[PDB]
């Protein structure tokens with residue numbers, strides 16, 4: 001398997017086609033974004049860390065019964081994945097108050113959410129991923145009621161599986177974002193799951209070990225990403 | 238039934254208690270708000286026009302089977318209503334793109350929405366009525382899943398009724414907001430329906446005849462309100 005041509009690139013990854021019409025190659029670059037693309041910086045080892053982090057997590061979700069895009073890793077920064085007809089809606093689950101929920105509602109950061117909250121956001125950098133809801137998906141044809149219901153079911157299952165996984169690693173899964181796509185008509189988990197798209201707090205100290213370190217100028221971004229990778233059991237070198 | 242004392246005064250109306258623990262007096266003032274209370278201005282006849290406009294609309298909705306708060310008109314600006322345990326969530330139906338939808342999604346104004354959209358906003362002027370969804374209602378306990386579903390059901394029914402009503406009046410019901418409350422356990426329509434909380438365009442010229450005239454300083458605010466009153470056949474004098 002080899003990259004055929006660059007299809008398109010986002011804020012952090014490059015998507016390539018392959019000789020196989022149903023397979024794509026995803027490249028995790030060192031580009032790290034904030035403000036939905038307004039601020040982007042490069043961190044060495046970032047793409048590699050996230051590529052291996054994503055493989056590990058998706059592997060765990062797949063074992064739990066969650067259908068994923070993953071085929072295999074091709075290098076430190078690339079992975080072969082099924083070509084998915086992506087639903088341009090980001091699925092977010094919040095176990096504790098943080099980020100936009102805090103700014104938006106004025107809720108105290110760290111408050112535990114029971115049951116957890118579920119947010120739907122439209123993928124539109126220009127508009128800073130505006131919040132939408134189920135009626136929006138039907139009215140604008142982003143995804144059917146049945147597929148959306150599947151997306152929510154799978155997102156919540158992922159939450160259950162990962163909360164345990166991170167707790168086992170002395171980490172608190174605060175919130176996270178998932179993106180799904182259709183493969184031959186079925187809902188499949190695509191994109192990625194990494195510290196770029198989730199908030200992870202050390203269980204005993206509450207120290208942030210995710211992209212917030214970049215969003216909020218705390219420094220030590222990659223060091224934190226790698227610390228979490230190591231706690232999970234991932235060998236970086 | 239008469240006013241006893243002021244319980245509280247909102248951006249546009251004043252609520253009074255009565256000898257009856259289950260009845261309140263709503264007083265529509267001439268106060269007209271924009272920016273969620275940031276900019277307020279007074280217009281003569283405004284309170285009276287909306288008070289009577291509201292009674293008329295509530296009546297039409299009642300005759301359609303929608304349970305409402307309304308008891309009776311008391312004066313040009315006052316009406317008697319059932320005391321409701323208000324749900325702090327604004328319910329919005331959008332038939333055509335306008336206002337915050339256009340602002341949030343960068344979508345074009347006037348675009349027809351099929352089916353119509355349904356937005357839920359937390360009632361909090363301080364935070365500018367932030368958009369929420371059903372999960373927030375469950376987690377923060379603003380309203381039971383059952384009652385919420387009834388709120389949406391009634392709102393959509395109100396839309397079916399009023400679209401017909403306004404269309405016959407040569408007008409386009411672009412969007413609108415409703416507030417519900419609990420009365421002895423049952424979900425009841427409260428607050429008001431007027432040009433203050435709805436968008437109404439002339440079917441032929443698409444001229445805005447609602448509070449956007451105030452929001453956008455287009456002049457002729459009440460003239461437009463009364464024009465709508467006349468097309469509906471609302472007695473004002």
Ligand SMILES: Nc1ncnc2c1ncn2[C@@H]1O[C@H](COP(=O)(O)OP(=O)(O)O)[C@@H](O)[C@H]1O
Nearest residue numbers: 010011012013015069081082083084086190191
């Ligand atoms: N398996 C897949 N098939 C097709 N597109 C995918 C797949 N997984 C992810 N994508 C898309 O590829 C892009 C990944 O690049 P990224 O830099 O994350 O983009 P963005 O700027 O939207 O965050 C996204 O648009 C994502 O939806």
Ligand SMILES: Nc1ncnc2c1ncn2[C@@H]1O[C@H](COP(=O)(O)OP(=O)(O)O)[C@@H](O)[C@H]1O
Nearest residue numbers: 247248249250252306318319320321323427428
């Ligand atoms: N039937 C009712 N019973 C109790 N409260 C009501 C009823 N109808 C409306 N209210 C509440 O009374 C207030 C009406 O006044 P208004 O000036 O519109 O207020 P606000 O500035 O809060 O929007 C609102 O807070 C509304 O929720």
Ligand SMILES: Nc1c(C(=O)O)ncn1[C@@H]1O[C@H](COP(=O)(O)O)[C@@H](O)[C@H]1O
Nearest residue numbers: 098099100101175176177196197198199
């Ligand atoms: N990574 C992204 C993006 C994005 O990249 O557009 N949107 C949300 N998220 C992730 O979802 C959670 C909630 O994000 P917000 O608090 O900003 O809504 C966080 O873990 C975040 O990293």
Ligand SMILES: Nc1c(C(=O)O)ncn1[C@@H]1O[C@H](COP(=O)(O)O)[C@@H](O)[C@H]1O
Nearest residue numbers: 335336337338412413414433434435436
């Ligand atoms: N009047 C209000 C309020 C309010 O007063 O807070 N919130 C929504 N609305 C009405 O709902 C529709 C959508 O409003 P937005 O476009 O602001 O979301 C409009 O008809 C508006 O007047």
Ligand SMILES: [Mg+2]
Nearest residue numbers: 010011012191
């Ligand atoms: Mg992305």
Ligand SMILES: [Mg+2]
Nearest residue numbers: 036123124129
């Ligand atoms: Mg995004």
Ligand SMILES: [Mg+2]
Nearest residue numbers: 090121128129
């Ligand atoms: Mg986003």
Ligand SMILES: [Mg+2]
Nearest residue numbers: 247248249428
């Ligand atoms: Mg009001």
Ligand SMILES: [Mg+2]
Nearest residue numbers: 327360361366
């Ligand atoms: Mg409001």
Ligand SMILES: [Mg+2]
Nearest residue numbers: 327358365366
């Ligand atoms: Mg509002």
